[PDB]
Amino acid sequence: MNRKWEAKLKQIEERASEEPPSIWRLFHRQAQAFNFVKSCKEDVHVFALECKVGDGQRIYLVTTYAEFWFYYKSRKNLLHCYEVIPENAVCKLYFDLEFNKPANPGADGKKMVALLIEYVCKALQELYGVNCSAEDVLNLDSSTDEKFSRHLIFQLHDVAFKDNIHVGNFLRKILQPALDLLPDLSFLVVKNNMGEKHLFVDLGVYTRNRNFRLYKSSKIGKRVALEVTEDNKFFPIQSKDVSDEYQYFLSSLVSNVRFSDTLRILTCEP
DNA sequence: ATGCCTACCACA
DNA sequence: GTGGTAGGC
Ligand SMILES: Nc1ncnc2c1ncn2[C@H]1C[C@H](O)[C@@H](COP(=O)(O)OP(=O)(O)OP(=O)(O)O)O1
Ligand SMILES: [Ca+2]
């Protein structure tokens, strides 16, 4: 309720101011886009598009995964797109990983990713009995000369988290040995620009309706798009009916939890 | 016409 | 300890 009231209170504050089957609908307000989704029989999802302005202004788009990919895959249009991870929606385990390269000259980013996956896979086994390995982790890279940047999206067989807030509670729980510095989790500690210690794992992405940059999109002011990392070990099952790139796209979507008649939903309370 | 929220510091 | 905020995702 405390979270539902504050959101609805922004709606009252904002209130102060034949053909082929297709569902391409744009909205200025995120709440309007979700109101349309609930009022829509098809399986549509909310995307966020960065506006040309240098700020973080966003315009929200509702459509199906398939139609979005159709108009998105050429990378000629819809640059700088984000997935809106809906609050209270089941979601995959995912990570935002970063550190300043000049400020961490000794750090081996590739090694840190493998160690993190190893530890997270142990925690999933000890706390939930879930078995997985690096072969289940989609590894996306957006690194620059200055920044080591990865997105990991776990592809767990018939398993998902209740919502992305629970993902955050799970990570805060198992990374507590590392947060205390700010099990031996010293490898996660990195320096920011100002020499202030931080964790390699960005915990700020587990918030309600978090935007999460799409596979093959870049930030508005930049040119580096998220692409599959060379050391990626998750390979989707190939199908004669869909392209491999579409399969990677669907795997990369945090909110695109594979339908299963034996799905287990993992919760983690604060 | 973006949304979210913790870390941080000043006050009983 | 809470406010109470603005700085960062
Ligand atoms: N100003 C914002 N408004 C809304 N959502 C945001 C904003 N900044 C970041 N986000 C969301 C989208 C990002 O994909 C996600 C993580 O932030 P961040 O690490 O800065 O970007 P990123 O991981 O997409 O690129 P990179 O780290 O390579 O610069 O949080
Ligand atoms: Ca990042």
Numbering used by the authors: 1 to 17, 36 to 200, 261 to 348
The authors write:
PrimPol is a human DNA polymerase-primase that localizes to mitochondria and nucleus and bypasses the major oxidative lesion 7,8-dihydro-8-oxoguanine (oxoG) via translesion synthesis, in mostly error-free manner. PrimPol is important for both nuclear and mtDNA replication and belongs to the archaeo-eukaryotic primase-polymerase family that differs from other DNA polymerases by possessing a primase activity. The PrimPol catalytic core clasps the template-primer by two α/β modules, ModN and ModC. ModN (residues 35−105) interacts primarily with the template DNA strand and the template oxoG base, whereas ModC (residues 108−200 and 261−348) carries the catalytic residues Asp114, Asp116, and Glu280 and interacts with the incoming dCTP nucleotide: functions normally associated with the finger and palm domains of DNA polymerases, respectively.
The structure of the extension complex is almost identical to the unmodified complex (rmsd of ~0.46 Å over 249 Cαs of molecule A, for example). The oxoG(anti) at the extension position of the active site is in a Watson−Crick base pair configuration with the 2′-deoxy-3′-C14 terminal primer base. Overall, the oxoG(anti) template strand residue is accommodated at the extension position without significant adjustments to the active site or to the position of its partner primer terminal C residue, compared to the unmodified structure. This correlates with the near-normal efficiency extension from oxoG•C pair by PrimPol (∼75−85% of that observed for undamaged DNA).
